[PDB]
Design a protein around this motif. Structure first.
Motif, PDB file in Angstrom:
ATOM      1  N   UNK A   1      -3.444  -5.640   0.023  1.00  0.00           N
ATOM      2  CA  UNK A   1      -4.896  -5.550   0.143  1.00  0.00           C
ATOM      3  C   UNK A   1      -5.584  -6.295  -0.995  1.00  0.00           C
TER       4      UNK A   1
ATOM      5  N   UNK B   1       4.382   1.292  -2.587  1.00  0.00           N
ATOM      6  CA  UNK B   1       3.038   1.438  -3.143  1.00  0.00           C
ATOM      7  C   UNK B   1       2.585   0.138  -3.792  1.00  0.00           C
ATOM      8  N   UNK B   2       3.428  -0.428  -4.659  1.00  0.00           N
ATOM      9  CA  UNK B   2       3.048  -1.652  -5.357  1.00  0.00           C
ATOM     10  C   UNK B   2       2.846  -2.805  -4.384  1.00  0.00           C
TER      11      UNK B   2
ATOM     12  N   UNK C   1       9.401   4.560  -2.745  1.00  0.00           N
ATOM     13  CA  UNK C   1       7.964   4.730  -2.472  1.00  0.00           C
ATOM     14  C   UNK C   1       7.106   4.005  -3.489  1.00  0.00           C
ATOM     15  N   UNK C   2       7.503   4.036  -4.764  1.00  0.00           N
ATOM     16  CA  UNK C   2       6.770   3.296  -5.787  1.00  0.00           C
ATOM     17  C   UNK C   2       6.782   1.802  -5.491  1.00  0.00           C
TER      18      UNK C   2
ATOM     19  N   UNK D   1      17.050  -8.519  -3.227  1.00  0.00           N
ATOM     20  CA  UNK D   1      16.081  -7.489  -3.634  1.00  0.00           C
ATOM     21  C   UNK D   1      14.797  -8.062  -4.205  1.00  0.00           C
TER      22      UNK D   1
ATOM     23  N   UNK E   1      -3.086   4.088  -6.777  1.00  0.00           N
ATOM     24  CA  UNK E   1      -2.244   4.528  -5.674  1.00  0.00           C
ATOM     25  C   UNK E   1      -1.562   5.835  -6.053  1.00  0.00           C
TER      26      UNK E   1
ATOM     27  N   UNK F   1       5.320   5.850   4.826  1.00  0.00           N
ATOM     28  CA  UNK F   1       5.153   4.579   4.132  1.00  0.00           C
ATOM     29  C   UNK F   1       6.237   3.568   4.486  1.00  0.00           C
ATOM     30  N   UNK F   2       7.279   3.973   5.213  1.00  0.00           N
ATOM     31  CA  UNK F   2       8.310   3.029   5.620  1.00  0.00           C
ATOM     32  C   UNK F   2       7.864   2.186   6.809  1.00  0.00           C
TER      33      UNK F   2
ATOM     34  N   UNK G   1       2.135  -2.603  -1.118  1.00  0.00           N
ATOM     35  CA  UNK G   1       0.969  -2.331  -0.285  1.00  0.00           C
ATOM     36  C   UNK G   1      -0.322  -2.629  -1.038  1.00  0.00           C
ATOM     37  N   UNK G   2      -0.386  -2.243  -2.314  1.00  0.00           N
ATOM     38  CA  UNK G   2      -1.596  -2.472  -3.096  1.00  0.00           C
ATOM     39  C   UNK G   2      -1.911  -3.958  -3.201  1.00  0.00           C
ATOM     40  N   UNK G   3      -0.881  -4.792  -3.354  1.00  0.00           N
ATOM     41  CA  UNK G   3      -1.091  -6.232  -3.474  1.00  0.00           C
ATOM     42  C   UNK G   3      -1.405  -6.878  -2.130  1.00  0.00           C
TER      43      UNK G   3
ATOM     44  N   UNK H   1      11.440   3.772  -7.819  1.00  0.00           N
ATOM     45  CA  UNK H   1      11.650   4.500  -6.571  1.00  0.00           C
ATOM     46  C   UNK H   1      11.101   3.689  -5.398  1.00  0.00           C
TER      47      UNK H   1
ATOM     48  N   UNK I   1       1.576   8.438   1.561  1.00  0.00           N
ATOM     49  CA  UNK I   1       0.528   7.960   0.663  1.00  0.00           C
ATOM     50  C   UNK I   1      -0.610   8.975   0.661  1.00  0.00           C
TER      51      UNK I   1
ATOM     52  N   UNK J   1       0.394   3.848  -9.059  1.00  0.00           N
ATOM     53  CA  UNK J   1      -0.056   2.618  -9.689  1.00  0.00           C
ATOM     54  C   UNK J   1      -1.290   2.927 -10.528  1.00  0.00           C
TER      55      UNK J   1
ATOM     56  N   UNK K   1      -0.015   6.326   6.557  1.00  0.00           N
ATOM     57  CA  UNK K   1      -0.071   7.316   5.489  1.00  0.00           C
ATOM     58  C   UNK K   1       0.928   8.440   5.721  1.00  0.00           C
TER      59      UNK K   1
ATOM     60  N   UNK L   1       7.435   9.952   1.029  1.00  0.00           N
ATOM     61  CA  UNK L   1       7.152   8.791   1.861  1.00  0.00           C
ATOM     62  C   UNK L   1       5.719   8.821   2.396  1.00  0.00           C
TER      63      UNK L   1
ATOM     64  N   UNK M   1       4.422   9.330  -7.448  1.00  0.00           N
ATOM     65  CA  UNK M   1       4.456   7.946  -7.900  1.00  0.00           C
ATOM     66  C   UNK M   1       3.038   7.387  -7.896  1.00  0.00           C
TER      67      UNK M   1
END
Lengths: 994, 152, 151
Positions: free
Chosen positions: B17, B10-11, B6-7, B98, A926, B33-34, B13-15, B4, A933, A976, B30, A931, A974
């Protein structure tokens, strides 16, 4: 005029202390003996707080060396009495406090006219013992404090009788009951924790069954669990049915104090630092020996960094431990290293240690006038030796530490000339210009921080001065209201120390992503460290992240009433401020807000939406409808509440008022809709007798069954809903009357309402087709536009809080909730933070003590301290900073907070991807910028065509259809990633250098 | 602990899928990301079992300190979902921490479509219908699912 | 010389002679009163991975007065607050002069293995331990990896 408080001046302090504490403070005459640095730091805080009178006494002349911590002295005043010249300046801090000078203290009976007496370092111990004795026997409260360089103490003596009324100041705990067993065990509704302690007292109300339990009688609490407590047998009261709210009650506690003469020999210690428990009895003998030294030596303290004087002070301290064997105990020898350090620094006069005790003592002065909070009992000793630099670099001896004929001679006496020069030449960034910002600047002005050739201060704050600021921001005066904080505060501190004249750059800019052209790479790189004087967490979390990126130390600080804290953030060493902060307060559920309030916090949050609906959002829709060409067809596919938006506009044309009388009518009709009709509709769906599924009452537990409101113009909350409603509506439409005519008059509003027809209630595409068609063309409605209201909570003339409190209370009457007044509603709806100068001043002292460690580039984490303080108890905690946690990928270890990857040049995506694989053994999965991707491995192959051959800057434009601006030199990213085994791994961020 | 936001996204979102939640889709823009687009299949043997329901999900600035905002885009007859798509969920307000995820929020809504609670209502008209006229309330729910929730 | 240093001396000499499994406890060369302690996280607890550092002080009136003790390592635990303060019956209610610092250390070791979030001196991580036990242990395991030293 006894019994009046200026609520606009004392607003924020009034949420800390409250009304009764402050009515008693204005009944108190306070005397301060000794007006060097520590003296003024007390008087300043006590005058700002507001006593009946402040009287000062120091008939000895001003020397240059006094300016080391006397911010109210300039080089103009040398040769003149400190009491006289200082007294004219304190007089400016608060108009409601007379400030007088005591010209002579020839007799101890002159003390009779004062409720509190505060003796400082200028007063000798023989006089302190005599003054204290007269005070104890006479019923006068006595406080004393001394600072000797990086050391200090304070003593408190309030007599044989002193009654604490509120020991904490916490808003009393309260909660809902679900079961009270015959033995007295009380279980909490929906398993919410009561937040109580053993020895608390509760009263109950609304407990059906145990009737007499609700008469206001108190009940001592034995805590069972986090969700249950016991109050004793309730068999006599009856048997429990349902309902109930317990409410904690604070009961008076009587206490007695020992005189100074008694406590010198048998002291009662309040401790400041866990790892220094032993030093208290050591410094107790030491501070005494200093006085004995001075009476041996024509009034002089030990020579600075002198071994002959320190070797005698050891001797003097040893004789005392024979005279006072209780102090040290048995087996405890004298700590000779600690007394030699005390002797080396006796002359020392340190800003940070003064502001610390200035606040601590002043707070205890306030406790003495009011009986609010739990006083200190009775000695407290404190030292910040770890602020001392490394003697390998900045050695301390009789030469390096000698006076140089400057205002800093007493600081040079502790640290030496080299270090003091290094402070002066430092480059600092201060974010914020409020209470903390002000005290910070004044500390740095005393240190000379920024006055050196290659040193400077930068202070920024976009906000302006208002009246309530003056209660704790002491660089501002009445005539400065409406001006810019940072600019006036910069001037203010230059008047104190002209060595900074032209070295503070007072800016007016907010600190976010939009001002990174002003606060750019070169700005941040040149700084030595950053200091935070801000309230709101989003700006602080930003500054915290800029510091991580540029690897700069950051000193964070904050107060919440009497509570304070400090935090040191150190590159490659500690956590950051965002690393660990505790979550916020939970939000109010929508169903609770909408239909089922049971707490004034709920009604106030409902009234705030309604204020925003009537007088801000309605007028924004209407004005867009009247100006933007496609707003009508935009709404049909853009907004969420398309129905209500069109309704709002329609209503704004149907109900267009023409005189103030039409607004009064509108308000009365909204009263019916909101507090009569909508309740009847609610009760229509769910009557008072409604049953749930399972078949237990619907209105039960957290639910209160409402009653519709019959309008009554003599009910204060009904009258003011229509007055503020009428006036806010009139503002939207530019209508005449309003409150600048006179004070509101029930009778004239009555005449209007009496002749109104008010409708009875009846239990209540093509909807929109009507709304859409029934709206005229805008062109028709020439020359007309609404003026939306801008919610400001601190203008009393503007009706805003008047509406929210009346609206809130009317709805409270529906649901049988106790009404609140304006100051409380202004606290919850304004999201106001209680703030008093005592804590502010104190916290700032601690932060500047930790600054010395930055100037010496301390890399040892155990040298630093994170402070907690609760001046209500009082309690002082000091902990070691939390170490930055360490990560690991592919056997390579990294700092989860401070490390990152750095790639020079605008790189192609696939170049970056293979670059990581062949360098770190990592597989980017990733990738984001801000904000957006930019790359993801789950993207379709056709998505990945677009992107893989693109430089990162063009890639950013591909995704966002908007490109990086020219001033941008770097880009954070950022990612992954997976390691050599394909297992996932945590990895730091990427910096791109364009 | 932290990262962060976004990080964080990202994490998460990756999980989403890497292993998806049965019956639910959830993909972000894209561009932003919010903002997420979600669809939820109606649970088995519920009045919603036949249709697909579309949701909008926004992650606020202080996520995951602040909870995600959610709005139903599909019209639905449900005690806890109002005329504007607003939802009543404990995890959104009172039980948020959180440590929780988007995955948690989506499973909670799926659990809510399968088991309404009209005893804590948002749409008051339809809750008293759910309490007093249950079989008829489910009839209107099955009908609105056919009228407004497309198919599948 | 005097009573209390002789007490410490004898207790320190036994902590050397027979040490307590999993625990380090040595006094400062500066100050016989202050002790530096380390405690291994018990096996099959959420803390099993790390080492936790404590500081222990023996007050003037010891052993009438109980030892003061402070967690130096950050930990997620119902009975240990943000400042390192501990809630132990032996420290307040069940303290007698007959007990030792050996007793205190074993009690803390027992507490890391078996929290009590129902005790009256508890926090708010306690209601997390009650309501969301598996998630509370998840956060404990995480903080152990973030903040407690490895072994």
């Amino acid at each position: 005029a006894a019994g009046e408080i200026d609520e606009s001046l004392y607003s924020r302090q009034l949420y800390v202390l409250g009304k009764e504490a402050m009515l008693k403070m204005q009944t108190s005459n306070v005397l301060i003996l000794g007006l060097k640095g520590l003296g003024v730091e007390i008087a300043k805080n006590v005058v700002l707080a507001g006593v009946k009178s402040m009287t000062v006494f120091d008939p000895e002349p001003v020397q240059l060396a006094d300016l080391s911590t006397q911010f109210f002295l300039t080089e103009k005043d040398i040769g003149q009495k400190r009491g006289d010249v200082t007294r004219a300046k304190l007089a400016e801090l608060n108009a409601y406090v007379p400030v007088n000078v005591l010209d002579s203290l020839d007799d101890v009976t002159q003390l009779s006219q004062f409720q509190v007496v505060v003796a400082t370092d200028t007063v000798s111990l023989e006089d302190k013992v005599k003054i204290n004795e007269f005070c104890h026997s006479s019923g006068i409260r006595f406080i004393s404090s001394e600072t000797r360089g990086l050391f200090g103490n304070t003593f408190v003596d309030l007599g044989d009788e002193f009654t604490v009324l509120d020991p904490t100041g916490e808003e009393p705990r309260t909660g809902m009951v679900s079961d009270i067993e015959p033995d007295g065990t009380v279980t909490m509704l929906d398993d919410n924790r009561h937040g109580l302690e053993d020895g608390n007292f509760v009263r109950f109300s609304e407990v059906e069954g145990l009737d007499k339990l609700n008469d206001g009688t108190l009940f001592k609490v034995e805590v069972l669990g986090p969700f249950a407590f016991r109050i004793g047998s309730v068999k006599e009261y009856g048997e429990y049915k349902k309902g109930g709210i317990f409410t904690e009650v604070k009961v008076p506690r009587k206490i007695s104090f020992k005189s100074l003469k008694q406590q010198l020999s048998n002291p009662e210690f309040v401790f400041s630092d866990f790892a220094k428990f032993d030093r208290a009895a050591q410094l107790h003998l030491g501070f005494q020996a200093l006085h004995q030294f001075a009476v041996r030596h024509n009034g002089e303290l030990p020579r600075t960094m002198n071994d002959e004087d320190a070797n005698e002070l050891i001797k003097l301290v040893t004789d005392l431990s024979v005279q006072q064997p209780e102090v040290l105990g048995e087996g405890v020898d004298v700590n000779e290293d600690l007394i030699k350090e005390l002797s080396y620094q006796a002359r020392g006069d340190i800003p940070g240690v003064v502001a610390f005790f200035g606040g601590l003592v002043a707070q205890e002065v306030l406790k003495a006038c009011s009986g609010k909070f739990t006083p200190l009992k009775q000695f407290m000793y404190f030292d910040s030796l770890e602020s001392l630099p490394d003697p390998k670099n900045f050695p301390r001896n009789e030469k390096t530490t000698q006076p140089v004929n400057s205002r800093y001679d007493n600081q040079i006496a502790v640290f030496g000339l080299d270090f003091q020069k290094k402070i002066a030449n430092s480059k600092v960034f201060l974010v914020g210009s409020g209470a903390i910002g002000c005290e910070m600047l004044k500390n740095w002005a005393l240190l000379g921080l920024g006055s050196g050739s290659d040193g400077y201060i930068v202070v920024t704050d976009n906000d302006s001065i208002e009246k309530s600021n003056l209660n704790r921001q002491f660089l501002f005066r009445p005539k400065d209201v409406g001006k810019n904080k940072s600019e006036v505060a910069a001037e203010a501190v230059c008047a104190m120390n002209p060595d900074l004249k032209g070295k503070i750059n007072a800016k007016i800019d907010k600190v976010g992503p939009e001002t990174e052209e002003i606060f750019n790479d070169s700005f941040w790189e040149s700084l030595d460290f950053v200091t935070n004087a801000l309230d709101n967490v989003d700006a602080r979390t930003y500054v915290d992240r800029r510091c991580v990126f540029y690897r700069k130390p950051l000193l964070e600080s904050g107060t919440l009433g009497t509570k304070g804290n400090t935090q040191v953030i150190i590159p490659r060493l500690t956590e950051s401020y965002s690393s660990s902060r505790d979550p916020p307060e939970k939000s109010i559920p929508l169903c609770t807000l909408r239909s089922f309030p049971n707490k004034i916090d709920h009604t106030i949050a409902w009234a705030k939406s309604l204020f925003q609906g009537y007088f801000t959002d309605s007028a924004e829709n209407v004005n867009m409808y009247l100006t933007q060409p496609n707003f009508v067809e935009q709404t049909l596919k853009q907004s969420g509440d398309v129905k209500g938006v069109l309704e709002s506009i329609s209503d704004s044309l149907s109900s267009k008022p023409h005189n103030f009388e039409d607004c009064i009518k509108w308000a009365r009709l909204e009263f019916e809709k909101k507090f009569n009709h909508d309740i009847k509709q609610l009760l229509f769906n769910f009557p008072k007798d409604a049953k749930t599924s399972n078949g237990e009452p619907f209105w039960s537990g957290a639910k209160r069954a409402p009653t519709p409101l019959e309008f009554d113009i003599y009910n204060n909350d009904h009258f003011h809903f229509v007055v503020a409603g009428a006036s806010l509506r009139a503002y939207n439409y530019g209508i005449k009357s309003d409150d600048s005519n006179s004070k509101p008059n029930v009778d004239e509003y009555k005449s209007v309402i009496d002749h109104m027809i008010i409708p009875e209630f009846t239990p209540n595409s093509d909807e929109i087709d009507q709304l859409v068609s029934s709206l005229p063309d805008p062109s028709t409605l020439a020359g007309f536009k609404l003026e939306p209201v801008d919610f400001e909570k601190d203008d009393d003339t503007n009706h805003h809080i008047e509406f929210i409190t009346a609206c809130s209370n009317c709805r409270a009457q529906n649901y049988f909730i106790e009404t609140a007044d304006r100051q409380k509603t202004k606290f919850i709806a304004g999201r106001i933070i209680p703030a008093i100068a005592t804590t502010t001043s104190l916290v700032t002292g601690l932060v500047n003590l930790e600054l010395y460690k930055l100037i010496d580039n301390k890399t040892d984490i155990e040298q630093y301290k994170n402070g907690f303080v609760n001046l209500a108890l009082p309690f002082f905690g000091f902990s070691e900073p939390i170490a930055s946690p360490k990560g690991e990928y592919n056997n390579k270890k990294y700092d989860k907070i401070w490390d990152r990857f750095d790639i020079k040049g605008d790189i192609k995506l696939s170049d970056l991807i293979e670059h990581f694989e062949k360098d770190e053994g990592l597989e980017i999965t990733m990738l984001s910028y801000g904000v957006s991707l930019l790359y993801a491995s789950f993207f379709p192959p056709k998505k990945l065509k677009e992107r893989l051959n693109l430089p990162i800057t063009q890639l950013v434009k591909l995704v966002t259809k908007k490109d990086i601006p020219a001033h941008v030199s770097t880009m954070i990213l950022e990612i992954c990633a997976d390691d050599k085994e394909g297992e996932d791994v945590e990895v730091p961020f990427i910096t791109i250098h364009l | 602990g932290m990262a962060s936001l976004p990080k964080r996204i990202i994490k998460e979102t990756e999980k989403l899928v890497s292993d998806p939640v049965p019956g639910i889709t959830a993909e972000p823009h894209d561009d932003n990301l919010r903002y997420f687009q979600v669809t939820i299949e109606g649970p088995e043997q519920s009045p919603y079992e036949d249709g697909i329901f579309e949701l909008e999900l926004y992650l606020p600035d202080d996520y995951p300190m602040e909870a995600p905002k959610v709005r139903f885009l599909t019209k639905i007859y449900h005690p806890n979902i109002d005329r504007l798509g607003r939802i009543c969920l404990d995890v959104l307000k009172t039980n948020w921490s959180p440590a929780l995820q988007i995955r948690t929020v989506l499973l909670s809504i799926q659990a809510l479509l399968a088991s309404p609670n009209p005893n804590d209502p948002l749409a008051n008209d339809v809750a008293e219908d759910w309490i007093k006229n249950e079989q008829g309330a489910k009839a209107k729910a099955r009908e609105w699912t056919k009228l407004y929730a497309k198919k599948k």
